[PDB]
Every structure is written in structure tokens, then in C-alpha cells.
Design a protein around this ligand. Structure first.
Ligand SMILES: Cc1nc(=O)c2cc(CN(C)c3ccc(C(=O)N[C@@H](CCC(=O)O)C(=O)O)s3)ccc2[nH]1
Ligand SMILES: Cc1nc(=O)c2cc(CN(C)c3ccc(C(=O)N[C@@H](CCC(=O)O)C(=O)O)s3)ccc2[nH]1
Ligand SMILES: O=c1ccn([C@H]2C[C@H](O)[C@@H](COP(=O)(O)O)O2)c(=O)[nH]1
Ligand SMILES: O=c1ccn([C@H]2C[C@H](O)[C@@H](COP(=O)(O)O)O2)c(=O)[nH]1
Lengths: 281, 281
């Protein structure tokens, strides 16, 4: 039974039993969902519609950098954070005095410098705040059965400095039988666009962490809070609800990388990815 | 089907195929990673019946949390001693926390809920207007923007971990409103299925009843998401016994008078009817 059917059943449920609720734009939604994806023999990149894999990779490395600069992601060809880094959008957020591309203390800053005072995207933060990436990497290496291997992006005190508050709040990691697993808690999930993307991101993070630590990829567990469908997306989502999953691709890591920071997009080969055609939403 | 059978199934799964691990202090647990159970709050209250749950503790401890107290001496005064061991002068010394008055647990749940991001100095100090008051934040959201997808309270603060007596188990809870009902999901990084988890279920269910009462809504669903779900090997025998017990119907919870603020609840506003658990083990 294909694991992608979990995602497809969740879609089907939200569309059929979801709550119909409206500030700006309207959605169908359910609350509390969990799905499991094996990482042992394949990589759970959804096949019912093509997922922007190039975006997935560039954005994770950009996160892992600690960068909060939407321009630096943009330079690589990935424009998904650009609407949010415009001086116009920032102004609308009451953050007008930002330079272009300064998103505030978003994921990268929270992952590498939690609790630090944010100044701007160009400030040097070395040795400031709590480095969560170094923290979990050390625990996975030297104390793998620890129950506190967590990386959290939710920092309520920093919300008003943020262009957009984080959706995927925290990940926890788990080690058993030489396998590295990961649970992601996502407060909010757009099933039409974000959620396939998000599944891929944290699955990737786990492959990367597994590699760097000498472990094999295990399970990725996806726990949603608000799982929702935007109503404008209903006829394209019914389209994808008709399609049968193709087998998952595999993910190869093309070289020895000793540090989470030394990865490059060319270290990853996506083998045998054959999605159905892209659906625009 | 009776909801407690979710918990008991989880017990059995862990006992049957759980992973046999040791910590770096040598103690053995069986554990599994990634679990979710749903408990209805509408017609009843999910206080577990196959073993008696310390309900007096549940109530006093939560009221204690909601006040922002990080003083174990205060909870202990009520006759509830569950945090006394962690508050002892010797425990804190064992943690490497000198200059600590007895009962000073550090920036734990209460401090995080009320003053997230604030500079902790001590349990007696006064933090008014320091940090981010998450409790007011969520009560406000549930009242004035119930469909917000960021109705979050979080206790995981990486920067404060070395200052805490114990690191938080309940990382965060999220709330959700639909069709006149308040719902809640909790992310728990670590659950002792033997002692902690029944208690923990009662705690956040109770919190949801209180929030529902204060905001003019009916208790909806409580979703319980776990990370490391485990059983200490020493308790396997009493748990075998527990698993033979047939669950009895859940009690109910009546809130006596009208309470207008989350801070004005007293242990007396709560009527538990009728809790008839199998004998304690
Ligand atoms: C309403 C909303 N839903 C989302 O899913 C969402 C996601 C992000 C960030 N994110 C995690 C994204 C992942 C993928 C994206 C995207 O734009 N994909 C395009 C592909 C672009 C292209 O043509 O190359 C798409 O397929 O529409 S955006 C930001 C705001 C959002 N807003
Ligand atoms: C290893 C471990 N497991 C736990 O479950 C745990 C729980 C807490 C805090 N906690 C969340 C607790 C919930 C319930 C508790 C308890 O001891 N209840 C007693 C009541 C004692 C009495 O009635 O006098 C009991 O149920 O027997 S303690 C602290 C450390 C822990 N440590
Ligand atoms: O990584 C992401 C980022 C955003 N979103 C979606 C979820 C919501 O539909 C919207 C964010 O809006 P709020 O939930 O923050 O209001 O974008 C995702 O699914 N994944
Ligand atoms: O509210 C609580 C507090 C603690 N624990 C348990 C979980 C673990 O067995 C232990 C905490 O140890 P660590 O997870 O921190 O190692 O206590 C709970 O189940 N619930």
C-alpha cells in the first residue's frame, strides 16, 4: 500500500468533512493529522503532482546557513521567499525600515541563534544565541537515545520581527537500530502546495543528518495542526485525487560530507522521479 | 469504541515491538517513536480508568503553571508534592545550579507560558511586563480571531535549558476553533506510558475545558501527539496487569461558577463526576 495514499486520503477527508471557515480568503480544514513515510528504500517525494525539488534543496541549505536573507535564496534561482522579502511586503508588516530581502529572525536565525537579539540580515551573529543544529548533531553522535533531540523554530518573542511566522514549528529526532527518524510538527499545512514540499524538506534534512552522523535514514513522521485546502484549489485538487501514485524515487548522496554546513545541491541525485504533470494552484 | 483503548493499544504496541534501549546512565526502556490519539471532550472528560490518575495533582499543578510560578514550594503547600524532588536543594546542586534557593526550578513551564524570552533571575523575582505572555496571547486569539492558525503556547526554549531543573516534556500545544468548539493538540517529546502520560492527557484536556469556559465555547477534541513513547522495563509487570482491566466509562467535568479569566480558577470550581477507576497499581 503506497504511502502517498496517506496524503491522498487526508486530502479526500478535508474536502469531504473539513470545516468551512473564512480574515482573508476561505478554506476547508481539519485539526490533528499524522502520516508516516519510510526513508529506508526510497525518498517520499510525492508523484501525484510534480514537486519543486530544486526549491526544496536550495531552501534547506539556505536555512542551514542561518541565513535570513531572501536575496541569497533568490540568487540561486529560487524565488519562493521573494514576495515576502519585498520592501513593500515588509512595510505592510510594519517593518518598513528593513533593507530588501531582510525577513527577520526566521528559520535560519532560530536554528543557529535561538534567543539572540535580531538586528538585521547582514549582522554577524557568531556565538550568539543557542545553536540548535550543533546541538542535535552532537546529541545524535554522542547520545543518540536522548529524548531531547529537538530543533524548534517557534519563538513567540520574535514574531513581530518576522516577515511570516514559521509553519513547521519543530522537529524531533530518534535513533534506533542504527536508523535516524524524525517527527515534524507543523502548525499549518496547505495541502495544495506547501505540504508535499514540506514532506520533502524534512525528509531531506534527515538524509543529510543520517549521512553526517553515520546512520541510515529511518522514518519521517508528519504531524499536522491545521490541515487545510483553499477553496480556489478545489477543482485542481479533485484532478490530482483521480491520479494513482507512481513508485517513489531514491535519493543518493554523491560524496562524503562531514558537516551539515558543507552540503551543496550537486551532492544530491534524485533517481527515478516520475511524477504526474504539474498542476498550477 | 472506547477512547482509552487507543492508549492500551499503544501500550501493547510498545511492549510487543518497541525498541530495547539504554540511556547514557544505563537504564532500560522499550520505546516507539511517533504516536497520535484523539480524545473527545464533548460528552465526557478523558481521565483514564484502567489505573487511577492523580486528579488532585492535575488540577493543582495546572493552576500553578497558569500563574507563572516556578516555585515548587508553592505547589507543595497545596499538598501536591510531584515537583518537590526537582525543587530540593540537593537536586539543583546535582544539576549544577548553585546560588539556588530551595524550590527555585528555573525558567520552566510557568515562566515560559507567561514571560517567554525574559531574562530569568529567580523564582521570587518579579517579571511583570518581561517577555511574551503566551497565555494572554492565545486567550485573545481564541476570543477575537478564532480561526487564526497560530494559536500556540510553547514551553521549549533552548536558550533556557541549562537553567531548568527539568527540560519540558510538553513542548507545545495548539488550539483550534470550529463550529463553536475549542480543540487542542499537544506535542509531547517524551512520555512515560506507565505514569506520566495518563496524567498528561488529563492536564491538557483540563486546560481546554478552562479555555472553553473563559471564551464562551464548548470543549471539542484533545489530540495527543507523542515523540518518544516508552515504558521503563521495571514496570512491564504491573502494566501487564493493567492491560487486562476493562476500561470503564469516562467521568465528566462540571465547571461550577462562571470564571472570566484563566487566572481566577480555584480547585473548587471543578466537579468531577463520576470517576470510578480500577484500583491503583
Ligand atoms: C497559501 C500558501 N500556501 C503555501 O503552500 C505556501 C508555501 C510557501 C513556501 N513554500 C514552502 C513553497 C513551496 C513551494 C512553493 C512554490 O511556489 N511552488 C511553485 C513552483 C514555482 C515554479 O514554477 O518553479 C508552484 O508549483 O506553484 S512556495 C509560502 C507561502 C505559502 N502560502
Ligand atoms: C521517570 C518519570 N516518569 C514520570 O512519569 C514523571 C512524571 C513527573 C511529573 N508528573 C507529570 C507526574 C504526574 C503524576 C505523578 C505522580 O507521581 N502521581 C502519583 C501521585 C502520588 C500520590 O497520590 O500521593 C501517583 O499517580 O501515584 S508525577 C516527573 C518525573 C517523572 N519521571
Ligand atoms: O512551509 C509552509 C509555509 C506555508 N504554508 C501555508 C500554510 C498556510 O496555508 C499558509 C500560511 O498561513 P498561516 O497559517 O500562517 O496563516 O501557507 C505551508 O503549508 N507550508
Ligand atoms: O510530564 C511529564 C514529565 C515527565 N515525563 C517522563 C518522560 C520521561 O520518562 C521522563 C523525562 O525524562 P527525559 O525525557 O527528560 O529524559 O519523565 C512524563 O511522561 N511526563
Amino acid at each position: 500500500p503506497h504511502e502517498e495514499l496517506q496524503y491522498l486520503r487526508q486530502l479526500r477527508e478535508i474536502l469531504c468533512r473539513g470545516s468551512d471557515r473564512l480574515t482573508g480568503i476561505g478554506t476547508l480544514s481539519l485539526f490533528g493529522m499524522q502520516a508516516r513515510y519510510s526513508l529506508r528504500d526510497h525518498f517520499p517525494l510525492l508523484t501525484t503532482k510534480r514537486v519543486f525539488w530544486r526549491g526544496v534543496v536550495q531552501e534547506l541549505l539556505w536555512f542551514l546557513k542561518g541565513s535570513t536573507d531572501s536575496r541569497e535564496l533568490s540568487r540561486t534561482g529560487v524565488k519562493i521567499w521573494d514576495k515576502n522579502g519585498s520592501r513593500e511586503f515588509l512595510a505592510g508588516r510594519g517593518l518598513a525600515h528593513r533593507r530588501e530581502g531582510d525577513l527577520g529572525p526566521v528559520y535560519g536565525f532560530q536554528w543557529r541563534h535561538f534567543g539572540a537579539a535580531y538586528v538585521d540580515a547582514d549582522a554577524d551573529y557568531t556565538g550568539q544565541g543557542f545553536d540548535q543544529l550543533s546541538y542535535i548533531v552532537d546529541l545524535i553522535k554522542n547520545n543518540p537515545h536522548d529524548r531531547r533531540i529537538i530543533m524548534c523554530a517557534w519563538n513567540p518573542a520574535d514574531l513581530s520581527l518576522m516577515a511570516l511566522p514559521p509553519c513547521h514549528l519543530l522537529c524531533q529526532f530518534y535513533v534506533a537500530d542504527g536508523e535516524l527518524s524524525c517527527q515534524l510538527y507543523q502548525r499549518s499545512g496547505d495541502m495544495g502546495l506547501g505540504v508535499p514540499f514540506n514532506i520533502a524538506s524534512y525528509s531531506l534534512l534527515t538524509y543529510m543528518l543520517a549521512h553526517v552522523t553515520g546512520l541510515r535514514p529511518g522514518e519521517f513522521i508528519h504531524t499536522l495542526g491545521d490541515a487545510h485546502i483553499y477553496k480556489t484549489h478545489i477543482e485542481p485538487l479533485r484532478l490530482q485525487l483521480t491520479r494513482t501514485p507512481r513508485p517513489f524515487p531514491r535519493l543518493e548522496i554523491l560524496r562524503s560530507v562531514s558537516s551539515m554546513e558543507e552540503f551543496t545541491p550537486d551532492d544530491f541525485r534524485l533517481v527515478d522521479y516520475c511524477p504526474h504533470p504539474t498542476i498550477r494552484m
